């Protein structure tokens, strides 16, 4: 499976799922300074949508 797909260049996850771990627990906004707290409400951005491009469209067509 993995490590044979990786050796040959066949499609495979960049990180082996078996050798993948969570990131434990991080600060929950009560152990954090004010400047590192997540806003309570999501903020409008104008960058909140992914930019369309040719690569996204071709990759989806090749995936199908």
């Amino acid at each position: 499976g993995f490590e044979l797909d990786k050796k040959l260049g066949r499609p495979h996850p960049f990180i082996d799922p078996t050798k993948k771990k969570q990131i434990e627990t991080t600060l929950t906004s009560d152990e954090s300074w004010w400047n590192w707290r997540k806003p309570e409400k999501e903020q409008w951005s104008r960058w909140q949508r992914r930019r369309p491009d040719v690569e996204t469209v071709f990759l989806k067509a090749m995936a199908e």
Binding site: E42, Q43, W44, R46, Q48, R49
Partner: protein, 384 residues
């Protein structure tokens, strides 16, 4: 009444919707008195009333053919039921609806009538000019025997305005169409859009619309129509109240615009058993929704000042209604899930916003992908 009509068929998706009434080009029905008129001749000044409109004209509705055209552009399928004359203007109206891919098998031709032409007689009663109708136009003369029952069998939503209540012929025909649609399981959509005569008095209008109000499963009204039907002066007094010494809360100090959400107990005189969804529109700014189980408001917005020379609010009320109908047919959980209903109604808000960016209602009706794009640009991703 008796039996069915047509051959039963698998009925392609998306589900069909039927729009009933008069097909007209433009023709804003809701007319009241505004206190800020522009120059009577220089119509280049009149666009300033498009970006500071009268409240009743913030998102005007129109003829039912506007909703059908707008619904199709948003990705739905629609059929128009009505009558036009056999003259050249009648063909132009039908060719307009065929170009927009609206089904016109429900449209009947009257070869002896002139389209959009009413014969009236002028009288001089009590020293004042009045007119009375001698012969109604073909638009208001569809008969019950002329109904296309294949459309009424297939259609899942039956849509009509209160303009048909101003015609004795159409009113009788309307209630036969509703009977057929209900027998076939269709939902009844009453989009009020009160014409000029029905603004005269609350009591006469409430009696006139009561029968059609009781037959409707979905009702859309404007904030001005709802307040007029309940009590116009109480809500105007409520808006004009200012505390004498201090505000009751911090938000009252900001002197913001009033977006009052009517309680379901205030709405109770207008509620009935078969009503599934009541929507009260404050333009595109607010969409108050009411169901038997819950109620709430969807916050919207408007920007006509982004394009001061092409902005035109006419037809934006029809785009909002068409957007509601587009989502109701494809997302039936809207009736029972509040979070789903609010997300789907934001699609209708976006359609209304785009519709205000073009001169002419039909010319400016938006497509589905444009509406979906604007919705995702305006709202944060968690609200999509």
């Amino acid at each position: 009444v008796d039996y069915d009509d047509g051959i039963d068929f698998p009925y392609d998706d998306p589900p069909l919707v039927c729009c009933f009434g008069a097909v007209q080009k433009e023709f804003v029905p809701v007319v009241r008195v505004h206190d800020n008129p522009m120059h009577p001749d220089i119509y280049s000044q009149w666009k300033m009333l498009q970006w500071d409109p009268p409240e009743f004209g913030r998102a005007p509705g129109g003829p039912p053919s506007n909703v059908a055209i707008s619904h199709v552009r948003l990705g739905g399928r629609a059929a128009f039921m009505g009558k036009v004359g056999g003259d050249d203007y009648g063909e132009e109206l039908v060719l307009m609806m065929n170009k927009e891919r609206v089904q016109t098998r429900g449209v009947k031709f009257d070869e002896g009538a002139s389209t959009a032409c009413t014969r009236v007689k002028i009288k001089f009663e009590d020293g004042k000019m009045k007119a009375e109708t001698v012969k109604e136009p073909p638009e208001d003369s569809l008969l019950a025997s002329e109904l296309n029952l294949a459309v009424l069998k297939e259609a899942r939503i039956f849509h009509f305005n209160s303009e048909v209540l101003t015609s004795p012929t159409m009113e009788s025909t309307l209630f036969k169409a509703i009977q057929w649609s209900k027998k076939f399981g269709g939902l009844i959509f009453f989009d009020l859009n009160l014409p000029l005569p029905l603004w005269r008095s609350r009591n006469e209008t409430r009696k006139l619309i009561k029968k059609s109000w009781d037959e409707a499963n979905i009702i859309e009204v404007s904030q001005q129509e709802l307040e007029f039907l309940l009590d116009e002066e109480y809500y105007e007094r409520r808006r004009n109240y200012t505390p004498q010494y201090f505000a009751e809360d911090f938000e009252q100090t900001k002197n913001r615009r009033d977006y009052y959400h009517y309680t379901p107990e205030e709405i109770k005189p207008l509620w009935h058993d078969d009503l599934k969804l009541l929507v009260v529109t404050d333009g595109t700014l607010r969409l108050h929704y009411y169901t038997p189980k819950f109620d709430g408001v969807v916050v919207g917005t408007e920007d006509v000042l982004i394009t001061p020379f092409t902005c035109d609010r006419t037809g934006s009320g029809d785009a909002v209604v068409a957007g509601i109908m587009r989502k109701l047919t494809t997302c039936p959980e809207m009736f029972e899930d509040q979070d789903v209903l609010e997300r789907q109604l934001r699609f209708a808000v976006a359609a209304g916003i785009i519709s205000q960016w073009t001169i002419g209602a039909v010319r400016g009706f938006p497509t589905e992908s444009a509406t979906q794009n604007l919705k995702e640009q305006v709202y944060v991703p968690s609200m999509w």
